[PDB]
């Protein structure tokens, strides 16, 4: 099953090797603590790694493509909300490189 391959992708994205850039994506953006009160006006469908992990464990993805769409949604939200020169955008790109290289191996 390619959903076993999806659990592997998440283990890689949560690994210590990538923590320096993956950490802002581990949990939902805490809009209240960060003062990002315009976030929900710009981002219609928030997504993060812990939510993807919960969805995967709860059989909410029919296949690897549905799983992949939520991972790409997480990165697209980051690219849409932040200015392009923001530190978090560079971090999203580094994490997206980890994901895309592993996802391509299926
Ligand atoms: C529990 C945690 C995940 S957090 O939610 O406290 C948290 C803490 C800080 C943090 C994020 C989220 C953040 C995430 N993302 C997806 C965005 O698009 C952001 N734009 C701006 C920020 C974020 C501000 N910074 C990241 C900045 C240093 C590089």
UniProtKB/Swiss-Prot annotation:
For the site Acetylated histone binding, which positions are given? 82
Compartment annotation = Nucleus; Chromosome
> How is expression of this protein distributed across tissues?
Ubiquitously expressed.
- Reproduce the UniProt comment on modification after translation: Phosphorylation by CK2 disrupt the intramolecular binding between the bromo domain 2 and the NPS region and promotes binding between the NPS and the BID regions, leading to activate the protein and promote binding to acetylated histones. In absence of phosphorylation, BRD4 does not localize to p53/TP53 target gene promoters, phosphorylation promoting recruitment to p53/TP53 target promoters.
- For this UniProt entry, which residues form the secretion signal? none
Q: Domain Bromo: where?
A: 1-106
Q: Which disease is it linked to?
A: Cornelia de Lange syndrome 6: A form of Cornelia de Lange syndrome, a clinically heterogeneous developmental disorder associated with malformations affecting multiple systems. It is characterized by facial dysmorphisms, abnormal hands and feet, growth delay, cognitive retardation, hirsutism, gastroesophageal dysfunction and cardiac, ophthalmologic and genitourinary anomalies. CDLS6 inheritance is autosomal dominant. A chromosomal aberration involving BRD4 is found in a rare, aggressive, and lethal carcinoma arising in midline organs of young people. Translocation t(15;19)(q14;p13) with NUTM1 which produces a BRD4-NUTM1 fusion protein.
Q: What family is this?
A: Belongs to the BET family.
What is said about the domains? The NET domain mediates interaction with a number of chromatin proteins involved in transcription regulation (NSD3, JMJD6, CHD4, GLTSCR1 and ATAD5). The C-terminal (CTD) region mediates interaction and recruitment of CDK9 and CCNT1 subunits of the P-TEFb complex. It is also required for maintenance of higher-order chromatin structure.
Q: What's this chain's function?
A: Chromatin reader protein that recognizes and binds acetylated histones and plays a key role in transmission of epigenetic memory across cell divisions and transcription regulation. Remains associated with acetylated chromatin throughout the entire cell cycle and provides epigenetic memory for postmitotic G1 gene transcription by preserving acetylated chromatin status and maintaining high-order chromatin structure. During interphase, plays a key role in regulating the transcription of signal-inducible genes by associating with the P-TEFb complex and recruiting it to promoters.
Subunit organization: Interacts with p53/TP53; the interaction is direct. Interacts (via CTD region) with CDK9 and CCNT1, acting as an associated component of P-TEFb complex. Interacts with RELA (when acetylated at 'Lys-310'). Interacts (via NET domain) with NSD3, CHD4, BICRA and ATAD5. The interaction with BICRA bridges BRD4 to the GBAF complex. Interacts (via NET domain) with JMJD6 (via JmjC and N-terminal domains); the interaction is stronger in presence of ssRNA and recruits JMJD6 on distal enhancers. Interacts with NSD3. Interacts with NIPBL. (Microbial infection) Interacts with bovine papillomavirus type 1 regulatory protein E2. This interactions may serve for the tethering of viral genomes to host mitotic chromosomes allowing successful partitioning of the viral genome during cell division.
Q: What else is known?
A: JQ1, a thieno-triazolo-1,4-diazepine derivative, and I-BET, a benzodiazepine derivative, have been tested on tumors with success. Treatment with GSK1210151A (I-BET151, a I-BET derivative) has strong effets on mixed lineage leukemia and promotes myeloid differentiation and leukemia stem-cell depletion.
Q: What is this protein called?
A: Bromodomain-containing protein 4
What range of the intact protein is shown? 352 to 457 of 1362
């Amino acid at each position: 099953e390619q959903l076993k391959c999806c659990s592997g992708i998440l283990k890689e994205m949560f690994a210590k090797k990538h923590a320096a850039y993956a950490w802002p994506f581990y949990k939902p953006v805490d809009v209240e603590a960060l003062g990002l009160h315009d976030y929900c006006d710009i981002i219609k469908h928030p997504m993060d790694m812990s939510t993807i992990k919960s969805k995967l464990e709860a059989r909410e993805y029919r296949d690897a493509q549905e799983f992949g769409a939520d991972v790409r949604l997480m990165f697209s939200n980051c690219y849409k909300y932040n200015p392009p020169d923001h530190e978090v955008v560079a971090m999203a790109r580094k994490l997206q490189d980890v994901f895309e290289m592993r996802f391509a191996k299926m």
